[PDB]
DNA sequence: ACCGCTGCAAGGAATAGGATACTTGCGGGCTAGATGGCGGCGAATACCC
DNA sequence: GGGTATTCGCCGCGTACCTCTCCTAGCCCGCAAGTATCCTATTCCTTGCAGCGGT
RNA sequence: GGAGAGGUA
């Protein structure tokens, strides 16, 4: 079910988090079994309430969790990404808007290209975890409002 | 049967364009120069060695 | 003298030098010093339909020494070979060590397993220690004492 | 129930392949190996064949977990030479059919 | 680096100057010892030597 | 290619996955085979050993 | 001045030769007198009187075996390499040893 | 004008090379931690009867 | 047997005082070797088509 | 606390 949004960065629970691994494995399934970002607001808040302050870790396995919460409504089905760029992998039938696509397609060729049926290639020097998180966020923030 | 050994080489020979301005060795000292072993280096002349 | 005492014999000889940069020159440097045997060399580094049929060529006793990487450290039976000469055994584990001694025998012959080391004032300290551990274990089911020390 | 072995290099992939081979020589039982040794063409027609269901041992190195390898109904799992193969890629197998 | 540094440093023949004359200094710069590494020891020296 | 950097902090936890691969393992029950005596003597008669 | 042969062509061909100007060690200066200084403070390292490599005859004046006689010796002692020995027996015999 | 031949061209199959992941070792950095004595003497051989 | 002789290895080698320098090894990490895989260019090989010649 | 060097009687 993980339509994988690997970023080549660390996204976990570290073991100074939360010292016992049945506790770690079991926020584990609650996060990666939960269907809405509320339920993921809630996970959160009950991690926080439990355990204080959420480390780097622990914020980008949440944020990823939401990526593939919004990409598994919307239709990608691997988003990637490193840090020179990444490759979307979309399903048989998404919800990109087409005109739009080759609008941005033709605004930025050096930044989209399609290499393939299903795959887009971009191209971004995403040197820092955070930005390349942001990045991803408002790439498929623009996506959804032009779903169709 | 016998061996199939034929890999002796590969066909090098792409990619030679103006660049390689076919070995014409009237380079001036201090002009850059590629070698694609190890990259970008700066041309100091003819040197004899042992 | 342990490459011709195998040859005499009519057995073959693993000759291990775990080295592909210079494997061709080893091989080359051994046909030179031991004449007398037919030489091959067989590694995971080289293609695909040359090292199978290298590895087939040595099944059939199409030549007696081949000189090879530690490809042959996981269990390749090959029973008519009965004299592994590792050129360098300073570095290597006790379990690969052992693995390596136990692909000779497999059979009702005789077989020797030459461990070849530099001058031992130039071996490091674990190095000693884990020849004289694979040296002190010689016998027949001597591979759970083994594991049980390594 | 599909055997699948699984051995720490493509020598033992084959001799493994040949011993096999040899030992089910008289009985209905299909054996196969699949390695770099086998070509691209026919590793995807050993895969098709395995997930439909028709390769009852199916030899292989390392390429046995590379999570293309969809086995119909796997019963029994043979790790050859354990000690060349990291936990990863001792539950790497163990993960995907649970009680094997 | 370490060989060197430990000649110069902590040897028997690297020593401490003694420094409270100028004849002292340039008299402890032309000593010949008879020790040291490779040379005889102090308490096993005959009365010949 | 920057070899030195010691990369990250343990890309992922393996003892969350291997404890839950173990714990699912041993959870379940596998399969009970059933043995054929007189069909496995042949086989067994096929060993020249 | 690394070369590096290739593997290729037959014994004794140069593919690349690199070369580069490599730091090793720190090597004390004398100053302008002969003076070291190690770590602060000003040592000399004091000349050596010692055995000069080469031949050697000595012997053991009458003071072995209690014969009263005096057996004559000969060391060869090279700069690097093993010594050799030749002594005299008791018995007038000539006896030859290394190391 | 119709058929055989050849050069060319495309299309997929090997093939190289880089990147990643296991085993093993080993060195570097930083921090817990062998050949210049000599006398005396009693015991251990080496030997000869 | 069993006494003599040669050799060998331990034990020993002055008292008191003053000044100075110099005293680190082991374990974790990143490099190397081997092995395995995937992934992406890049060359190589085979077969099918367009143009030209023989009849 | 120990080694190395030098010194006084």
């Known amino acids: 079910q993980q339509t994988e949004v690997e970023l080549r960065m660390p996204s976990l629970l570290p073991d100074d988090f939360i010292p016992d691994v049945n506790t770690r494995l079991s926020f584990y399934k609650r996060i990666a079994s939960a269907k809405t970002e509320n339920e993921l607001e809630e996970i959160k808040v009950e991690l926080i309430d439990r355990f204080g302050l959420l480390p780097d870790p622990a914020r980008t396995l949440l944020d990823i969790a939401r990526l593939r919460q919004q990409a598994q409504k919307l239709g990608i089905r691997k988003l990637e990404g490193n840090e020179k760029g990444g490759v979307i992998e979309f399903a048989e039938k998404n919800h990109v808007n087409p005109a739009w696509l080759i609008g941005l397609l033709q605004k930025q060729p050096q930044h989209y290209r399609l290499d393939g049926p299903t795959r887009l290639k971009f191209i971004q020097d995403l040197s820092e975890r955070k930005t390349r998180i942001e990045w991803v966020r408002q790439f498929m923030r623009e996506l959804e409002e032009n779903a169709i | 049967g016998e061996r199939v050994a034929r890999r002796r080489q590969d066909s090098r020979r792409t990619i030679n364009p103006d660049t390689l301005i076919r070995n014409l060795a009237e380079l001036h000292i201090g002009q850059p120069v590629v070698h694609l072993e190890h990259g970008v280096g700066r041309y100091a002349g003819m040197t004899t060695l042992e | 003298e342990a490459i011709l005492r195998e040859i005499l014999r009519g057995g073959q000889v693993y000759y291990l030098y775990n080295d592909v940069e210079n494997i061709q020159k080893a091989a080359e440097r051994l046909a030179e010093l031991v004449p007398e045997a037919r030489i091959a060399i067989g590694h995971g580094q080289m293609r695909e339909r040359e090292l199978e049929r290298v590895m087939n060529d040595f099944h059939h006793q199409r030549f007696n020494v081949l000189v090879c990487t530690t490809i042959i450290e996981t269990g390749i039976d090959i029973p008519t070979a009965n004299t592994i000469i590792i050129e360098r055994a300073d570095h290597f584990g006790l379990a690969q060590l052992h693995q390596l001694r136990g692909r000779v025998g497999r059979s009702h012959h005789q077989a020797y397993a030459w461990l070849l080391t530099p001058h031992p004032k130039a071996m490091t300290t674990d190095a000693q220690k884990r020849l004289e551990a694979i040296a002190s274990l010689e016998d027949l089911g001597a591979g759970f004492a083994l594991a049980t020390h390594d | 129930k599909q055997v699948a072995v699984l051995v720490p290099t493509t020598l033992l992939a084959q001799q493994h392949y040949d011993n096999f081979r040899d030992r089910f020589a008289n009985w209905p039982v299909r054996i196969e190996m699949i390695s770099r040794f086998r070509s691209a063409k026919e590793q995807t027609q050993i895969l098709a064949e395995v997930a439909e269901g028709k390769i009852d041992i199916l030899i292989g190195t390392h390429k046995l977990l590379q999570s293309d390898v969809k086995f119909k109904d796997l019963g029994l799992l043979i790790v050859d030479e354990e000690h060349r193969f990291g936990v990863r890629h001792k539950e790497r197998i163990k993960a995907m059919r649970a009680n094997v | 680096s370490a060989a060197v540094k430990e000649f110069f440093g902590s040897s028997q023949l690297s020593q401490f100057m003694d420094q409270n004359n100028p004849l002292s200094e340039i008299t402890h710069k032309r000593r010949i010892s008879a020790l040291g590494p490779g040379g005889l020891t102090r308490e096993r020296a005959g009365f010949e030597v | ?49 | 001045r690394l070369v590096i042969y290739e593997r290729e062509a037959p014994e004794g061909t140069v593919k690349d030769i690199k070369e580069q100007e490599v730091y090793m060690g720190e090597i004390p200066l004398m100053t302008d007198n002969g003076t070291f200084v190690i770590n602060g403070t000003e040592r000399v390292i004091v000349s050596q009187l010692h055995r000069s490599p080469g031949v050697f005859f000595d012997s053991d004046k009458g003071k072995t075996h209690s014969s009263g006689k005096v057996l004559y010796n000969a060391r060869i002692i090279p700069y690097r390499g093993s010594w050799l020995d030749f002594e005299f027996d008791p018995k007038d015999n000539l006896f030859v040893r290394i190391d």
């Open chain 6, 1 to 49: 290619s920057r070899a030195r950097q010691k990369a990250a902090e343990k890309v992922r936890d393996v003892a969350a996955e291997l404890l839950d691969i173990y714990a699912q393992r041993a959870a379940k029950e596998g399969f009970a085979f059933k043995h054929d005596r007189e069909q496995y003597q042949l086989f067994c008669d096929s060993f020249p050993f």
